[PDB]
Tab-separated table of N, CA and C in Angstrom:
chain	number	residue	atom	x	y	z
Q	1	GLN	N	1.015	14.774	19.089
Q	1	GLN	CA	2.059	15.136	18.128
Q	1	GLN	C	2.156	14.080	17.051
Q	2	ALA	N	2.521	14.520	15.838
Q	2	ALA	CA	2.781	13.599	14.755
Q	2	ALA	C	4.057	14.025	14.093
Q	3	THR	N	4.776	13.059	13.522
Q	3	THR	CA	5.944	13.345	12.708
Q	3	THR	C	5.804	12.487	11.468
Q	4	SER	N	6.238	13.040	10.339
Q	4	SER	CA	6.122	12.317	9.090
Q	4	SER	C	7.312	12.555	8.191
Q	5	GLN	N	7.587	11.617	7.300
Q	5	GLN	CA	8.681	11.721	6.337
Q	5	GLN	C	8.203	10.972	5.075
Q	6	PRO	N	8.574	11.428	3.892
Q	6	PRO	CA	8.288	10.647	2.675
Q	6	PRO	C	9.096	9.339	2.684
Q	7	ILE	N	8.574	8.328	1.999
Q	7	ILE	CA	9.359	7.109	1.808
Q	7	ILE	C	9.085	6.586	0.388
Q	8	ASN	N	10.145	6.390	-0.372
Q	8	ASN	CA	10.005	5.787	-1.682
Q	8	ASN	C	9.730	4.304	-1.566
Q	9	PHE	N	9.099	3.753	-2.605
Q	9	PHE	CA	8.818	2.310	-2.640
Q	9	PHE	C	8.583	1.867	-4.010
Q	10	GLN	N	8.603	0.522	-4.163
Q	10	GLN	CA	8.194	-0.101	-5.411
Q	10	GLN	C	7.449	-1.401	-5.141
Q	11	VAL	N	6.290	-1.574	-5.706
Q	11	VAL	CA	5.609	-2.893	-5.645
Q	11	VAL	C	6.260	-3.796	-6.665
Q	12	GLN	N	6.677	-4.987	-6.187
Q	12	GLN	CA	7.401	-5.969	-7.020
Q	12	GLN	C	6.616	-7.314	-7.114
Q	13	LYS	N	6.964	-8.100	-8.148
Q	13	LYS	CA	6.277	-9.323	-8.472
Q	13	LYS	C	6.568	-10.425	-7.449
Q	14	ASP	N	5.593	-11.289	-7.224
Q	14	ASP	CA	5.773	-12.450	-6.365
Q	14	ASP	C	6.932	-13.272	-6.921
Q	15	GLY	N	7.918	-13.601	-6.085
Q	15	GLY	CA	9.028	-14.508	-6.439
Q	15	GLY	C	10.169	-13.881	-7.168
Q	16	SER	N	10.189	-12.530	-7.300
Q	16	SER	CA	11.329	-11.845	-7.904
Q	16	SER	C	11.406	-10.380	-7.453
Q	17	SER	N	12.410	-9.687	-7.887
Q	17	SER	CA	12.510	-8.250	-7.615
Q	17	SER	C	11.959	-7.375	-8.763
Q	18	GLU	N	11.381	-7.996	-9.790
Q	18	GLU	CA	10.893	-7.296	-10.948
Q	18	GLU	C	9.750	-6.389	-10.546
Q	19	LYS	N	9.669	-5.179	-11.088
Q	19	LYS	CA	8.560	-4.327	-10.851
Q	19	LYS	C	7.233	-4.971	-11.241
Q	20	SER	N	6.208	-4.786	-10.424
Q	20	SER	CA	4.835	-5.175	-10.742
Q	20	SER	C	4.044	-4.059	-11.331
Q	21	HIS	N	3.097	-4.391	-12.224
Q	21	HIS	CA	2.163	-3.378	-12.761
Q	21	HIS	C	1.303	-2.813	-11.623
Q	22	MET	N	1.197	-3.524	-10.496
Q	22	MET	CA	0.505	-2.981	-9.337
Q	22	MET	C	1.122	-1.656	-8.862
Q	23	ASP	N	2.430	-1.486	-9.102
Q	23	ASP	CA	3.079	-0.249	-8.661
Q	23	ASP	C	2.408	0.969	-9.266
Q	24	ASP	N	1.876	0.781	-10.469
Q	24	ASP	CA	1.188	1.954	-11.147
Q	24	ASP	C	-0.114	2.387	-10.441
Q	25	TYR	N	-0.661	1.476	-9.623
Q	25	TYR	CA	-1.906	1.777	-8.914
Q	25	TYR	C	-1.760	2.560	-7.639
Q	26	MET	N	-0.524	2.932	-7.281
Q	26	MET	CA	-0.296	3.633	-6.010
Q	26	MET	C	0.575	4.855	-6.278
Q	27	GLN	N	0.273	5.929	-5.575
Q	27	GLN	CA	1.079	7.188	-5.757
Q	27	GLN	C	2.438	7.063	-5.068
Q	28	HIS	N	3.420	7.844	-5.581
Q	28	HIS	CA	4.789	7.763	-5.024
Q	28	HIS	C	5.270	9.203	-4.769
Q	29	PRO	N	6.103	9.418	-3.770
Q	29	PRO	CA	6.445	8.435	-2.734
Q	29	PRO	C	5.266	8.303	-1.780
Q	30	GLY	N	5.345	7.343	-0.880
Q	30	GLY	CA	4.390	7.254	0.217
Q	30	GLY	C	4.878	8.102	1.372
Q	31	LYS	N	4.327	7.880	2.568
Q	31	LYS	CA	4.691	8.639	3.748
Q	31	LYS	C	4.746	7.711	4.947
Q	32	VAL	N	5.736	7.909	5.823
Q	32	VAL	CA	5.740	7.284	7.141
Q	32	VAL	C	5.219	8.295	8.132
Q	33	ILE	N	4.319	7.880	8.972
Q	33	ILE	CA	3.793	8.770	10.069
Q	33	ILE	C	3.950	8.077	11.358
Q	34	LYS	N	4.409	8.848	12.357
Q	34	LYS	CA	4.408	8.347	13.738
Q	34	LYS	C	3.428	9.250	14.495
Q	35	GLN	N	2.404	8.626	15.044
Q	35	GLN	CA	1.461	9.379	15.910
Q	35	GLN	C	1.111	8.497	17.116
Q	36	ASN	N	0.893	9.123	18.319
Q	36	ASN	CA	0.687	8.394	19.571
Q	36	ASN	C	1.408	7.025	19.729
Q	37	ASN	N	2.719	7.113	19.493
Q	37	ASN	CA	3.730	6.057	19.577
Q	37	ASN	C	3.477	4.884	18.622
Q	38	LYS	N	2.709	5.136	17.561
Q	38	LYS	CA	2.451	4.105	16.573
Q	38	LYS	C	2.853	4.595	15.209
Q	39	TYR	N	3.264	3.640	14.342
Q	39	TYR	CA	3.754	3.974	13.008
Q	39	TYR	C	2.822	3.513	11.941
Q	40	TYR	N	2.706	4.306	10.881
Q	40	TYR	CA	1.917	3.954	9.732
Q	40	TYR	C	2.624	4.280	8.451
Q	41	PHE	N	2.357	3.459	7.432
Q	41	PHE	CA	2.712	3.802	6.063
Q	41	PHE	C	1.431	4.345	5.394
Q	42	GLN	N	1.431	5.622	5.007
Q	42	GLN	CA	0.229	6.251	4.426
Q	42	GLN	C	0.464	6.353	2.913
Q	43	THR	N	-0.533	5.885	2.160
Q	43	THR	CA	-0.343	5.703	0.729
Q	43	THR	C	-1.659	6.021	0.050
Q	44	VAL	N	-1.560	6.476	-1.177
Q	44	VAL	CA	-2.737	6.896	-1.939
Q	44	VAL	C	-2.985	5.936	-3.116
Q	45	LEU	N	-4.176	5.330	-3.122
Q	45	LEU	CA	-4.528	4.387	-4.130
Q	45	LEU	C	-5.131	5.097	-5.323
Q	46	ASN	N	-4.550	4.911	-6.511
Q	46	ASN	CA	-5.112	5.438	-7.789
Q	46	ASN	C	-6.244	4.584	-8.227
Q	47	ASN	N	-7.209	5.159	-8.952
Q	47	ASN	CA	-8.338	4.381	-9.459
Q	47	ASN	C	-8.962	3.521	-8.393
Q	48	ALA	N	-9.285	4.184	-7.294
Q	48	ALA	CA	-9.727	3.503	-6.061
Q	48	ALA	C	-10.929	2.616	-6.333
Q	49	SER	N	-11.803	3.089	-7.258
Q	49	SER	CA	-13.008	2.314	-7.631
Q	49	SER	C	-12.673	0.889	-8.188
Q	50	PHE	N	-11.430	0.721	-8.680
Q	50	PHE	CA	-11.000	-0.590	-9.209
Q	50	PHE	C	-10.558	-1.561	-8.121
Q	51	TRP	N	-10.238	-1.025	-6.928
Q	51	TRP	CA	-9.692	-1.878	-5.856
Q	51	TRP	C	-10.845	-2.540	-5.129
Q	52	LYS	N	-11.236	-3.725	-5.523
Q	52	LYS	CA	-12.283	-4.484	-4.862
Q	52	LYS	C	-11.957	-4.903	-3.429
Q	53	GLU	N	-10.691	-5.319	-3.278
Q	53	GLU	CA	-10.192	-5.733	-1.941
Q	53	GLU	C	-8.710	-5.508	-1.895
Q	54	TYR	N	-8.221	-5.201	-0.672
Q	54	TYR	CA	-6.785	-5.136	-0.443
Q	54	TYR	C	-6.475	-5.585	0.970
Q	55	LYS	N	-5.379	-6.329	1.067
Q	55	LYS	CA	-4.876	-6.824	2.322
Q	55	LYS	C	-3.357	-6.660	2.357
Q	56	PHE	N	-2.859	-6.195	3.479
Q	56	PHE	CA	-1.443	-6.050	3.724
Q	56	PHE	C	-1.000	-6.938	4.868
Q	57	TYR	N	0.210	-7.391	4.689
Q	57	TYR	CA	0.904	-8.318	5.741
Q	57	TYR	C	2.323	-7.900	5.907
Q	58	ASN	N	2.912	-8.152	7.106
Q	58	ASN	CA	4.364	-7.979	7.233
Q	58	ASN	C	5.115	-9.150	6.594
Q	59	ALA	N	6.436	-9.101	6.616
Q	59	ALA	CA	7.238	-10.096	5.948
Q	59	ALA	C	7.073	-11.486	6.564
Q	60	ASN	N	6.541	-11.514	7.793
Q	60	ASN	CA	6.186	-12.798	8.459
Q	60	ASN	C	4.754	-13.243	8.222
Q	61	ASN	N	4.065	-12.559	7.298
Q	61	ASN	CA	2.679	-12.849	6.897
Q	61	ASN	C	1.638	-12.573	7.989
Q	62	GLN	N	2.034	-11.779	8.977
Q	62	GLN	CA	1.029	-11.287	9.941
Q	62	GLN	C	0.167	-10.195	9.355
Q	63	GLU	N	-1.114	-10.183	9.697
Q	63	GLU	CA	-2.035	-9.181	9.154
Q	63	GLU	C	-1.746	-7.790	9.704
Q	64	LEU	N	-1.784	-6.782	8.784
Q	64	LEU	CA	-1.565	-5.380	9.201
Q	64	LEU	C	-2.828	-4.609	9.102
Q	65	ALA	N	-3.210	-3.838	10.131
Q	65	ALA	CA	-4.429	-3.004	10.137
Q	65	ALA	C	-4.360	-1.950	9.086
Q	66	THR	N	-5.421	-1.797	8.333
Q	66	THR	CA	-5.521	-0.607	7.421
Q	66	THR	C	-6.738	0.255	7.843
Q	67	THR	N	-6.589	1.533	7.645
Q	67	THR	CA	-7.672	2.469	7.891
Q	67	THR	C	-7.763	3.454	6.772
Q	68	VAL	N	-9.001	3.852	6.424
Q	68	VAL	CA	-9.222	4.842	5.393
Q	68	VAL	C	-9.123	6.243	5.994
Q	69	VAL	N	-8.176	7.006	5.425
Q	69	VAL	CA	-7.902	8.377	5.887
Q	69	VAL	C	-8.784	9.370	5.074
Q	70	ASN	N	-8.901	9.070	3.771
Q	70	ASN	CA	-9.669	9.923	2.870
Q	70	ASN	C	-10.151	9.152	1.676
Q	71	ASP	N	-11.371	9.435	1.214
Q	71	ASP	CA	-11.902	8.917	-0.057
Q	71	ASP	C	-12.221	10.158	-0.882
Q	72	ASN	N	-11.543	10.291	-2.041
Q	72	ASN	CA	-11.798	11.413	-2.940
Q	72	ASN	C	-12.463	10.838	-4.143
Q	73	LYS	N	-13.815	10.893	-4.187
Q	73	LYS	CA	-14.591	10.245	-5.213
Q	73	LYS	C	-14.430	10.938	-6.555
Q	74	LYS	N	-14.288	12.252	-6.521
Q	74	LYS	CA	-14.045	13.072	-7.692
Q	74	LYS	C	-12.780	12.677	-8.454
Q	75	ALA	N	-11.667	12.467	-7.698
Q	75	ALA	CA	-10.349	12.082	-8.278
Q	75	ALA	C	-10.215	10.559	-8.420
Q	76	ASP	N	-11.187	9.862	-7.811
Q	76	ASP	CA	-11.140	8.407	-7.700
Q	76	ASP	C	-9.896	7.915	-7.038
Q	77	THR	N	-9.553	8.532	-5.901
Q	77	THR	CA	-8.420	8.022	-5.107
Q	77	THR	C	-8.877	7.723	-3.685
Q	78	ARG	N	-8.081	6.908	-2.988
Q	78	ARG	CA	-8.385	6.619	-1.569
Q	78	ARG	C	-7.024	6.685	-0.888
Q	79	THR	N	-6.987	7.357	0.253
Q	79	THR	CA	-5.772	7.438	1.091
Q	79	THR	C	-5.962	6.487	2.270
Q	80	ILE	N	-5.011	5.602	2.471
Q	80	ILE	CA	-5.082	4.653	3.588
Q	80	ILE	C	-3.806	4.719	4.446
Q	81	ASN	N	-3.937	4.323	5.720
Q	81	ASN	CA	-2.793	4.087	6.580
Q	81	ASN	C	-2.668	2.600	6.771
Q	82	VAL	N	-1.437	2.081	6.698
Q	82	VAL	CA	-1.171	0.673	6.950
Q	82	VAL	C	-0.278	0.603	8.171
Q	83	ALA	N	-0.698	-0.136	9.194
Q	83	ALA	CA	0.164	-0.199	10.409
Q	83	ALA	C	1.498	-0.853	10.071
Q	84	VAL	N	2.578	-0.248	10.532
Q	84	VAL	CA	3.919	-0.797	10.335
Q	84	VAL	C	4.770	-0.619	11.594
Q	85	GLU	N	5.979	-1.141	11.576
Q	85	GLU	CA	6.943	-0.881	12.646
Q	85	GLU	C	8.285	-0.412	12.063
Q	86	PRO	N	9.015	0.374	12.868
Q	86	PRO	CA	10.386	0.714	12.425
Q	86	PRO	C	11.125	-0.551	12.051
Q	87	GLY	N	11.910	-0.518	10.981
Q	87	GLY	CA	12.635	-1.699	10.537
Q	87	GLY	C	11.974	-2.528	9.460
Q	88	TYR	N	10.675	-2.383	9.280
Q	88	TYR	CA	10.018	-3.089	8.171
Q	88	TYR	C	10.658	-2.659	6.861
Q	89	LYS	N	10.957	-3.618	6.029
Q	89	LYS	CA	11.544	-3.388	4.715
Q	89	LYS	C	10.567	-3.657	3.602
Q	90	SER	N	9.567	-4.459	3.842
Q	90	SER	CA	8.534	-4.695	2.867
Q	90	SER	C	7.169	-4.972	3.478
Q	91	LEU	N	6.177	-4.965	2.638
Q	91	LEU	CA	4.802	-5.444	2.977
Q	91	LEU	C	4.428	-6.470	1.913
Q	92	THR	N	3.892	-7.608	2.354
Q	92	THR	CA	3.241	-8.475	1.388
Q	92	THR	C	1.864	-7.973	1.131
Q	93	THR	N	1.403	-8.006	-0.136
Q	93	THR	CA	0.072	-7.510	-0.401
Q	93	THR	C	-0.729	-8.551	-1.185
Q	94	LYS	N	-2.009	-8.509	-0.953
Q	94	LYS	CA	-2.981	-9.321	-1.705
Q	94	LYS	C	-4.066	-8.338	-2.157
Q	95	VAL	N	-4.161	-8.127	-3.448
Q	95	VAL	CA	-5.080	-7.070	-4.014
Q	95	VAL	C	-5.903	-7.599	-5.146
Q	96	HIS	N	-7.194	-7.281	-5.103
Q	96	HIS	CA	-8.150	-7.732	-6.148
Q	96	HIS	C	-8.620	-6.503	-6.925
Q	97	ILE	N	-8.197	-6.424	-8.172
Q	97	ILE	CA	-8.597	-5.324	-9.082
Q	97	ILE	C	-9.699	-5.832	-10.001
Q	98	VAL	N	-10.796	-5.079	-10.057
Q	98	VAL	CA	-11.932	-5.463	-10.883
Q	98	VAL	C	-12.440	-4.220	-11.612
Q	99	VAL	N	-12.686	-4.397	-12.898
Q	99	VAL	CA	-13.341	-3.374	-13.692
Q	99	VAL	C	-14.415	-4.153	-14.468
Q	100	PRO	N	-15.655	-4.315	-13.887
Q	100	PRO	CA	-16.672	-5.167	-14.500
Q	100	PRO	C	-17.130	-4.812	-15.907
Q	101	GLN	N	-17.074	-3.502	-16.230
Q	101	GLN	CA	-17.487	-3.098	-17.572
Q	101	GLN	C	-16.643	-3.693	-18.681
Q	102	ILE	N	-15.411	-4.028	-18.393
Q	102	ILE	CA	-14.571	-4.678	-19.385
Q	102	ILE	C	-14.201	-6.092	-18.987
Q	103	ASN	N	-14.916	-6.592	-17.977
Q	103	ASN	CA	-14.755	-7.978	-17.521
Q	103	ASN	C	-13.288	-8.240	-17.159
Q	104	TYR	N	-12.659	-7.217	-16.574
Q	104	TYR	CA	-11.295	-7.313	-16.077
Q	104	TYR	C	-11.363	-7.741	-14.618
Q	105	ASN	N	-10.594	-8.784	-14.265
Q	105	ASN	CA	-10.645	-9.282	-12.900
Q	105	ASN	C	-9.313	-9.883	-12.605
Q	106	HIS	N	-8.510	-9.271	-11.750
Q	106	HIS	CA	-7.091	-9.714	-11.535
Q	106	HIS	C	-6.788	-9.734	-10.102
Q	107	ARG	N	-6.073	-10.806	-9.655
Q	107	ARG	CA	-5.577	-10.900	-8.291
Q	107	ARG	C	-4.072	-10.737	-8.283
Q	108	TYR	N	-3.601	-9.764	-7.524
Q	108	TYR	CA	-2.210	-9.512	-7.341
Q	108	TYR	C	-1.762	-10.120	-6.028
Q	109	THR	N	-0.599	-10.806	-6.077
Q	109	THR	CA	0.112	-11.252	-4.905
Q	109	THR	C	1.512	-10.682	-5.119
Q	110	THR	N	1.807	-9.626	-4.356
Q	110	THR	CA	3.044	-8.889	-4.602
Q	110	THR	C	3.763	-8.523	-3.294
Q	111	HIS	N	4.936	-7.904	-3.401
Q	111	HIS	CA	5.630	-7.418	-2.216
Q	111	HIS	C	5.997	-5.962	-2.479
Q	112	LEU	N	5.555	-5.139	-1.576
Q	112	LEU	CA	5.824	-3.689	-1.632
Q	112	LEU	C	7.147	-3.442	-0.875
Q	113	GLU	N	8.167	-3.039	-1.614
Q	113	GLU	CA	9.533	-2.905	-1.090
Q	113	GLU	C	9.828	-1.449	-0.786
Q	114	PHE	N	10.060	-1.142	0.490
Q	114	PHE	CA	10.454	0.251	0.817
Q	114	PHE	C	11.886	0.500	0.386
Q	115	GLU	N	12.172	1.718	-0.039
Q	115	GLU	CA	13.533	2.054	-0.562
Q	115	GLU	C	14.572	1.923	0.550
Q	116	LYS	N	14.127	2.312	1.748
Q	116	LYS	CA	14.885	2.105	2.993
Q	116	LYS	C	13.906	1.544	4.012
Q	117	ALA	N	14.464	0.879	5.035
Q	117	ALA	CA	13.571	0.390	6.094
Q	117	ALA	C	12.774	1.522	6.744
Q	118	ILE	N	11.576	1.217	7.238
Q	118	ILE	CA	10.792	2.204	7.991
Q	118	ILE	C	11.690	2.780	9.141
Q	119	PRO	N	11.858	4.103	9.134
Q	119	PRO	CA	12.712	4.690	10.149
Q	119	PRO	C	12.096	4.818	11.549
Q	120	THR	N	12.937	4.888	12.594
Q	120	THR	CA	12.455	5.359	13.888
Q	120	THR	C	12.352	6.877	13.807
Q	121	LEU	N	11.259	7.422	14.330
Q	121	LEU	CA	11.105	8.878	14.164
Q	121	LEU	C	11.023	9.466	15.581
Q	122	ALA	N	11.516	10.705	15.737
Q	122	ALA	CA	11.573	11.332	17.038
Q	122	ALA	C	10.253	11.953	17.432
């Protein structure tokens, strides 16, 4: 069995609550999924070809498992699951965006803020 619910979020800048331009690289809302007693935040990365690396952590800086659910090369998107727990209010992220053709190379250190804490699901 699986249960899911949408969850709104905003990626915000390191050291403040200001929106990050990284927020534009992810589709909204995301989704919370509970399957085999485990919880995930499922999210769709825009311009997936630009994402050279991504890492997610909880608010205590522990590493969170990510898995690729879907790669849509035609749309240039990638759908991932990020392991979470009920009660999580944010994820710390470390993301490397690269577009070599324009010599664009940027490292984001941001915090993805859920609109509400990850819920317990039945």
